[PDB]
Structure formats: structure tokens, C-alpha cells
Amino acid sequence: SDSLLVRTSRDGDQFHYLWAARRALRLLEPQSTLVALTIEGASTTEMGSQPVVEDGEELIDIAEYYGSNELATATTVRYMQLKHSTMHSDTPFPPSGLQKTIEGFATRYKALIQKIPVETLRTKLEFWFVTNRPVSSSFSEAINDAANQHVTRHPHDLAKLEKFTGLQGAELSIFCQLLHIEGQQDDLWSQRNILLRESAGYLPDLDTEAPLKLKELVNRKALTESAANPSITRMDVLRALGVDETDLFPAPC
Amino acid sequence: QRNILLRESAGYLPDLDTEAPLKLKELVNRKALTESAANPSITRMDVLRALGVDETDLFPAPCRIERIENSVSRTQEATLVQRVVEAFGAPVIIHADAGVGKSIFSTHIEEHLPTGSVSILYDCFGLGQYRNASSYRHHHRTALVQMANEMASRGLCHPLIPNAGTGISQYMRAFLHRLSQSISILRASEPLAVLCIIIDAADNAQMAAEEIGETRSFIKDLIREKLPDGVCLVALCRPYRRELLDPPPEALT
Amino acid sequence: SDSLLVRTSRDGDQFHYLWAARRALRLLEPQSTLVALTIEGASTTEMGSQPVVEDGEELIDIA
Amino acid sequence: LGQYRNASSYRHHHRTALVQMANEMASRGLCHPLIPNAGTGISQYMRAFLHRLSQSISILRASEPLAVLCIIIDAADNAQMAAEEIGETRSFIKDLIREKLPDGVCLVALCRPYRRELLDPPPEALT
Amino acid sequence: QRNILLRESAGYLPDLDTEAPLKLKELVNRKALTESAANPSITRMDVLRALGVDETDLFPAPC
Numbered sequence: 001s002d003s004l005l006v007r008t009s010r011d012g013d014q015f016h017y018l019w020a021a022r023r024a025l026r027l028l029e030p031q032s033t034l035v036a037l038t039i040e041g042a043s044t045t046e047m048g049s050q051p052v053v054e055d056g057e058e059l060i061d062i063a064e065y066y067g068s069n070e071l072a073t074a075t076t077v078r079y080m081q082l083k084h085s086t087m088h089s090d091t092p093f094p095p096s097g098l099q100k101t102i103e104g105f106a107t108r109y110k111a112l113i114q115k116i117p118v119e120t121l122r123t124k125l126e127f128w129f130v131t132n133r134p135v136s137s138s139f140s141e142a143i144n145d146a147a148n149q150h151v152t153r154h155p156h157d158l159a160k161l162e163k164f165t166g167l168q169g170a171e172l173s174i175f176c177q178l179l180h181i182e183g184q185q186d187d188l189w190s191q192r193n194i195l196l197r198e199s200a201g202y203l204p205d206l207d208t209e210a211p212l213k214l215k216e217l218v219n220r221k222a223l224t225e226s227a228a229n230p231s232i233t234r235m236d237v238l239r240a241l242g243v244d245e246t247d248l249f250p251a252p253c
Numbered sequence: 254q255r256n257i258l259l260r261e262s263a264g265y266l267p268d269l270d271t272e273a274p275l276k277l278k279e280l281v282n283r284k285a286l287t288e289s290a291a292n293p294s295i296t297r298m299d300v301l302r303a304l305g306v307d308e309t310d311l312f313p314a315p316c317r318i319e320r321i322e323n324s325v326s327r328t329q330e331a332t333l334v335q336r337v338v339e340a341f342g343a344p345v346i347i348h349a350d351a352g353v354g355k356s357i358f359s360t361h362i363e364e365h366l367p368t369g370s371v372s373i374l375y376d377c378f379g380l381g382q383y384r385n386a387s388s389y390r391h392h393h394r395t396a397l398v399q400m401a402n403e404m405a406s407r408g409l410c411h412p413l414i415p416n417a418g419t420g421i422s423q424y425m426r427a428f429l430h431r432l433s434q435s436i437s438i439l440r441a442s443e444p445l446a447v448l449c450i451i452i453d454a455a456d457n458a459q460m461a462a463e464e465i466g467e468t469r470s471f472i473k474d475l476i477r478e479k480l481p482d483g484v485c486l487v488a489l490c491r492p493y494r495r496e497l498l499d500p501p502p503e504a505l506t
Numbered sequence: 507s508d509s510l511l512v513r514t515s516r517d518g519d520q521f522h523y524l525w526a527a528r529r530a531l532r533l534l535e536p537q538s539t540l541v542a543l544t545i546e547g548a549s550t551t552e553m554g555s556q557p558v559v560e561d562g563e564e565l566i567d568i569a
Numbered sequence: 570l571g572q573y574r575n576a577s578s579y580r581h582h583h584r585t586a587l588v589q590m591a592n593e594m595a596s597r598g599l600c601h602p603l604i605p606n607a608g609t610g611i612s613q614y615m616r617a618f619l620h621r622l623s624q625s626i627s628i629l630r631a632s633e634p635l636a637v638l639c640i641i642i643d644a645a646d647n648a649q650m651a652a653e654e655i656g657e658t659r660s661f662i663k664d665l666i667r668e669k670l671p672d673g674v675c676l677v678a679l680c681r682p683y684r685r686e687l688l689d690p691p692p693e694a695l696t
Numbered sequence: 697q698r699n700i701l702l703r704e705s706a707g708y709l710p711d712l713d714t715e716a717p718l719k720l721k722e723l724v725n726r727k728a729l730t731e732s733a734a735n736p737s738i739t740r741m742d743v744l745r746a747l748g749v750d751e752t753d754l755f756p757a758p759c
């Protein structure tokens with residue numbers, strides 16, 4: 001049927017919002033260095049006052065910034081891309097799938113390398129691929145051996161990786177040093193309740209409205225009305241739960 | 254659209270609420286995934302379990318007064334009922350001691366009203382189960398909900414469905430608001446219809462309240478409240494327990 | 507930009523769900539004749555036990 | 570073990586005792602599990618408990634027609650002493666002893682002779 | 697009667713208590729047709745995570 005292919009489009013957004021909402025909790029840690037999440041777009045303050053780099057921007061599902069909301073002085077920055085295939089959860093992906101993501105990652109990499117030198121960016125920058133399904137092991141081995149400068153056992157997968165990246169030698173190696181693969185995630189039916197279990201640790205009791213409210217916050221960052229500012233900060237999470245800083249320190253010494 | 258839903262949903266509840274517009278939207282959204290493709294329907298039970306109540310919460314205390322077939326000719330009652338309607342603007346209390354026929358008369362009174370009239374009958378005694386924790390009958394949040402949904406079932410006004418944490422003044426205002434709608438409906442089709450409220454066994458409720466440590470059963474507040482024009486209120490008790498429900502000086506005995 | 511045309515796709519679903527949720531309240535009326543809402547597809551019991559008509563089905567937002 | 574007067578270890582509220590007994594029958598396969606909710610009143614707990622008594626005895630007597638279900642409350646007076654020591658008046662047993670149970674279940678309590686009137690039996694009770 | 701439990705429309709506590717009967721059936725059905733995983737068995741930890749509770753929520757006061 002046709003309606004099946006329309007319904008299967010919504011489950012991907014549900015997976016995306018739940019998985020981002022589980023990440024958003026880390027802003028509450030009092031002795032941790034994370035500072036910002038941006039949903040469907042990089043930070044508008046990424047180059048400070050200077051205009052933003054638009055290359056490879058549309059693969060950005062989630063971006064995470066540590067230390068500063070600005071690539072020139074942040075300690076670490078992550079850009080992440082997600083995939084939720086519904087009906088084939090046990091079946092490994094081929095490299096012809098990861099091609100379409102690797103292309104855009106290299107496109108963003110080139111424009112970032114032009115403005116800031118490699119010896120800085122190689123300490124900061126990561127690209128992640130996150131998916132429900134397992135991923136081809138030999139392709140990962142080729143990625144590893146490229147990143148470590150060893151003769152791989154699978155030259156066809158390395159040739160495919162070269163075709164996808166358009167790079168060879170150590171310039172390929174550096175790029176493969178920034179590429180992270182994370183398969184075999186818990187599916188939607190599990191993700192829907194893991195969030196409840198993790199959110200129950202900050203509260204004094206079990207709760208059943210907080211997993212709704214964090215998801216609603218993440219969803220309302222993904223509309224057109226919030227396009228001027230896609231950021232999430234600690235104050236946003238606290239006013240989503242409905243408290244302010246005085247409730248955490250009601251009676252000072 | 255995001256706030257019109259709040260305004261329309263606030264009419265069925267006794268107070269303003271800010272979680273119901275989320276929950277109905279979540280219900281509709283979860284009907285639009287693949288997991289519910291076997292059944293895309295929405296029914297009344299789905300909406301009620303989305304709000305978190307069931308049919309027992311709309312009818313928490315049904316009537317139980319025994320009707321009888323034999324009825325000896327007994328001349329006073331036809332005068333005593335017109336004595337009520339011709340002495341409007343004040344609460345009326347009937348009293349007589351044990352086994353004289355108050356509860357039977359409460360079933361007969363309805364036949365003598367002017368045409369077009371409607372009467373609501375409430376039972377505070379049950380069958381001696383009113384003193385048990387699973388069968389209390391004396392709170393506002395039971396009797397007022399009972400009477401509101403009995404009028405709504407007959408087609409006079411909107412339903413009133415309970416919400417946790419709601420105080421006594423909100424239930425009083427929600428009840429008094431719907432009395433006016435019902436009396437407008439009655440006095441459209443006929444000029445002289447009345448709406449009559451009968452509280453049988455009014456003295457048991459205050460005994461049950463005082464036994465568990467409370468002091469204000471619902472009839473102890475309702476008797477001094479002022480009802481809209483065209484509404485009658487009658488209470489029946491034994492003669493020596495009459496001071497528990499403490500009538501105002503303007504009352505009729 | 508391209509991302510504008512992706513973001514504008516979500517607002518339509520938000521409008522759809524809010525507008526359907528306003529319709530769903532009418533099921534609570536004690537003296538009204540409405541019996542069912544079906545979201546993105548007609549009722550599977552539309553022809554009783556007989557198989558369902560599939561023509562023109564995908565324009566059905568709400569039934 | 571003498572902990573029942575410390576704030577983190579109370580045992581005399583409905584939402585502790587009835588949840589314990591319901592899940593102890595449910596773990597054995599006789600009824601659905603009962604899990605608590607914040608903001609629920611005591612009458613809802615009473616009705617939800619009686620429902621699962623009705624489930625359990627119907628499971629049992631379909632295989633042995635003269636079987637019974639026994640519910641035992643040890644140290645019944647201590648629950649009322651702990652309640653009155655902090656300003657309440659109705660521990661769970663003081664309500665449960667006057668409630669009407671389904672057929673095929675029996676209810677037994679144990680106490681010291683000089684403390685018996687704390688839990689105030691009705692005239693039908695057997696001693 | 698000796699073997700099958702069924703939901704009535706009444707008696708259950710609101711919210712999380714209502715859907716445990718459905719989620720046990722869902723867990724069993726999910727496990728039977730996810731034989732491609734490392735193992736299809738059910739153990740206590742998966743039951744507790746299916747219900748959403750912790751053991752101390754079921755047993756707040758042991759004997």
C-alpha cells in the first residue's frame with residue numbers, strides 16, 4: 001500500500017525527538033562541561049560575529065557544543081545524523097547507504113578546514129552516524145585502517161570509501177579519524193520508556209508527565225516559528241519542568 | 254489553534270487546565286503511527302482514559318431508595334408540596350421521626366409539580382453502607398458530580414467530569430453555573446416549570462463527616478448558598494438531629 | 507534555503523493534530539449521535555464484513 | 570523490626586499495605602499487578618483491592634470447589650499506635666475490618682489483650 | 697477461568713496501572729517474532745522494564 005510509506009515517515013521523527021530528549025538531560029549536571037544543543041541546524045553563533053558556513057548543513061540532526069557556543073573557542077563540537085529503518089531492524093546496511101552521509105560530512109569538513117587549520121580542528125571535531133540497524137563490519141575495518149595507516153584486508157571497501165570521500169592518503173586518514181559509527185540502538189518501543197527511567201533519577205519520585213514535556217520542547221524547536229533560534233539551554237529545561245534556580249536553593253546560609 | 258483548544262476543553266472540567274491540550278494531541282498523534290495501523294479509531298473510552306477517568310467517576314453514587322406499590326391514601330402530602338412552591342426564595346426542611354414515611358414521600362413528591370417541571374433526587378443513606386471507606390457519600394466531589402451528570406444525561410446541560418486537587422469553591426461555582434442553563438431550557442417551552450432538588454437523609458451526611466473528623470458536609474454549605482431563580486431545595490431530617498444541619502433564620506420548617 | 511521547506515512540513519502536521527483534537531471532544535456529549543473518528547484512513551468496518559473500498563483512500567485526513 | 574516509627578519506614582498507610590498484598594497475590598499468578606499513583610485517594614485503593622480479591626478467588630475455586638483465601642495481619646495494634654502518635658486516626662486495618670469481602674475469603678488479626686479496643690471491632694466479630 | 701485473565705472496563709487505577717495487561721502480551725508477541733536477536737527468552741529484568749516500575753515500587757514493605 002501507499003499509506004504504509006507515509007506512516008513510516010512519522011516513526012522516524014518520533015525516534016529523533018525521544019533520542020534527543022534523552023540527550024537534553026545532561027545540561028542539568030552541576031559539574032559537567034556541556035553547554036549547548038541545537039536541533040536541525042548548527043549554532044548561529046558558530047563563527048562568532050562572522051557569517052555562518054552553509055556547506056553540508058542539512059545532514060545536521062543534532063549539534064552539541066562544549067565550553068562555548070562557538071567553534072573558534074569551544075573545547076569540543078559534535079555533529080550527528082540519525083536513521084530509523086522500521087521493518088528491517090536486524091539487517092546490516094551496505095556502504096552504498098553510508099555514501100550519501102559521508103559525502104556531506106566531507107563537504108562540511110572542507111569548508112571548516114579552509115578557515116581554521118587542521119591541527120586545531122582535529123582535536124575538536126567529530127561526525128557521528130546513529131542508526132537502529134547493524135553496520136557492515138569490513139567497511140568499519142577499512143575506516144579504521146585508513147584512520148590508522150595500515151594495509152586493509154578488504155581493498156574493495158577501501159576503494160568504495162575513497163570513492164565516497166574523494167580523498168586518499170593521510171588527508172583521508174585525518175577524515176577517518178573524525179568518523180564514528182554507532183549501530184544497534186534500542187528501538188522505539190524501548191526508547192519510549194528508557195526516558196522515563198532516566199528522568200526518574202533527578203526527581204524524588206516516579207513521574208509520567210516529564211517524558212511528554214521534554215519531547216514537546218524538542219518538537220517545538222523543530223518548527224518554523226523557532227527558526228531564529230534553535231538552541232536549548234539549562235533555563236529552557238528548567239522552565240519546561242516548571243521550576244527556577246530558587247527552588248534548588250530555597251534557603252541559603 | 255494552539256489556545257482555542259484550551260478554552261474549549263476548559264468547559265468540561267471544573268477548572269482551567271494546562272495538561273489536557275497536550276494529552277488529546279498525543280492521543281491523536283499516536284493514532285497516526287504504523288503501530289496503530291491495525292485500528293485507527295477513536296471512541297469515548299479512549300478519550301476518557303486519555304484524561305484518566307472511567308464511567309464510575311461520572312456516576313460515583315447511584316440512587317437506592319426503594320419504591321413501593323401499595324400506597325395508602327394520605328391527604329397531607331398534596332398540601333405540603335404546594336406549600337413549597339408557593340413559598341419560594343428560602344430553603345424548606347421537612348421533619349418527622351422514625352418510620353413515618355419520609356423516604357416514601359420523597360418518591361411521591363414529583364407528581365404534583367406544575368407541568369414541565371423536573372426533579373433531582375439524592376440519597377445520603379444508601380442501605381447502611383455510607384459509613385464504609387469504599388462507599389462514602391458526603392463529599393462535594395461526589396454529590397455535585399452526581400447531580401450535574403444526572404441533569405446532563407437528561408439533556409439539559411454539559412457534563413462535569415472530575416479533576417484531582419480541585420477545591421470546594423470550584424465545584425460549587427461549576428454546579429451553580431449549570432443550574433441556570435437547565436432552568437433556561439425548562440422555562441423556554443413552558444412559562445411556569447420549576448427545577449427541584451431533593452436531599453433525602455440530610456442528617457446522616459453530617460454524622461459521617463464528624464465521625465472521620467471533618468466538620469462541613471456538602472449540605473451544610475449548600476443550605477446557606479443562594480440558588481438561581483426558579484430552583485427549589487428541600488431537605489428531610491429527624492426532629493432532634495435538626496440542629497446538626499443548622500438552618501439560617503430565614504429557613505422554613 | 508532548503509531547510510525552510512523541511513521545517514514548513516511539520517507545521518502542517520501540528521495544525522492537523524490540533525484541529526482533529528478539537529473535533530474529538532464531541533464524543534463526550536451525552537445526547538449526541540456521533541460515534542466514531544478515524545485518523546488517516548477510513549473505517550475497517552465500513553462495509554461490515556465485506557472487504558474495504560481502496561479507491562481515493564489517501565485523501566482521507568479525518569473520517 | 571522496630572522500624573515502624575521512623576519516617577522512611579512507615580507501614581500503616583493504605584498505599585503501602587494494599588499494594589504489598591495485591592502484588593503478593595499477583596506475583597503468584599492470581600491477579601493483575603497493582604502499581605501506585607501520586608494523588609490517588611483511599612477509596613480508589615479500596616475498590617481496586619476488592620476487585621483483585623474477586624479475581625484471585627475465582628482463579629482458585631475453578632479447580633478446588635472448597636478452597637479458601639486467607640489474609641493475615643500480624644501486630645495489628647502497632648499500626649494504630651503509629652497512626653495516632655503522629656496525629657492521624659484511621660490506619661488501614663481500622664477501615665478494612667468493617668469492609669465486606671467476597672465469599673470464600675477469611676480475615677484474621679492478632680493483638681495483645683489490653684490493646685484490643687484500639688481497633689474497635691463491630692458486633693459481628695468473633696474473638 | 698482456570699487459565700485466562702481478561703480486563704474489565706472498571707476497577708483499575710489510572711495512568712500506569714491501566715496498560716500492564718496489554719504490555720505483557722506485547723512483550724511476549726514481540727519476543728516470539730524477534731528470534732533474530734541473540735536470544736528470545738524472557739527474564740525478570742525485561743518484565744520489570746516492560747512494566748516501567750522498580751521492584752521497590754511493587755514491594756514497598758517486605759515481611
Ligand SMILES: Nc1ncnc2c1ncn2[C@@H]1O[C@H](COP(=O)(O)OP(=O)(O)OP(=O)(O)O)[C@@H](O)[C@H]1O
Nearest residue numbers: 323324325327349350351352353354355356357358
Ligand atoms: N404511603 C405508604 N404506604 C404504605 N406503606 C408506607 C407508606 N409510607 C410508609 N410506609 C411504610 O412505612 C415504612 C417506613 O417508611 P420510610 O422508610 O419512608 O420511613 P422514614 O420516616 O423515612 O424512616 P427513617 O426515619 O427510619 O429513615 C415503609 O417501609 C412502609 O412499610
Ligand SMILES: [Mg+2]
Nearest residue numbers: 355356378454
Ligand atoms: Mg429513611
